Amino acid sequence: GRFESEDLTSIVELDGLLEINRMTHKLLSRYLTLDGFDAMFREANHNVSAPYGRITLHVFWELNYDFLPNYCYNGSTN
C-alpha cells in the first residue's frame, strides 16, 4: 500500500521492507505454523486469482504518469 502511494523510486524501499517481512516470517515459523510466505505475499499482492499483482500494475501506472514524461536519461552515468 505504501508503494502504491509513492513513485517508482520507492520500489527499492518496498523490496527492503518485503525482505524484513520475509525474515519476520522465518523467525516466527520456528514456533508457529503459518501460511507459506510466498502464498501470503501473492494474496496481499492480489496475484493469486489474477495474472498481474498490485506491484506490477503500479509499476506500469508510474511509468505512464511519471517516469516517461518527467525523467531525463543520462547516458554517461546510466
Partner: protein, 67 residues
C-alpha cells in the same frame, strides 16, 4: 490371644488393601497423563491439518477463476 490374633490379621488385611488402592491410583494417574499426551497429539494433528486445508484452498485459487 483372640485380640492379638485379630490385630496381626488386621495388619495383613490393611496392607493388602493399601496395595490395591495404590494400584488403583497408578491407573488413575496413567489415565490423566495419557489424556494429556493425546491432547498434544490431537492439537498437533489439528495444526497440520488446518495448514494443509488452507494450502489446498490457496492452490485451488491459483488454478480456478474468480467471482
Amino acid at each position: 490371644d483372640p485380640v492379638q490374633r485379630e490385630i496381626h490379621q488386621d495388619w495383613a488385611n490393611r496392607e493388602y488393601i493399601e496395595i490395591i488402592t495404590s494400584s488403583i491410583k497408578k491407573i488413575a494417574d496413567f489415565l490423566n497423563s495419557f489424556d494429556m499426551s493425546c491432547r498434544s497429539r490431537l492439537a498437533t494433528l489439528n495444526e497440520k491439518l488446518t495448514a494443509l486445508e488452507r494450502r489446498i484452498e490457496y492452490i485451488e485459487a491459483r488454478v480456478t477463476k474468480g467471482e
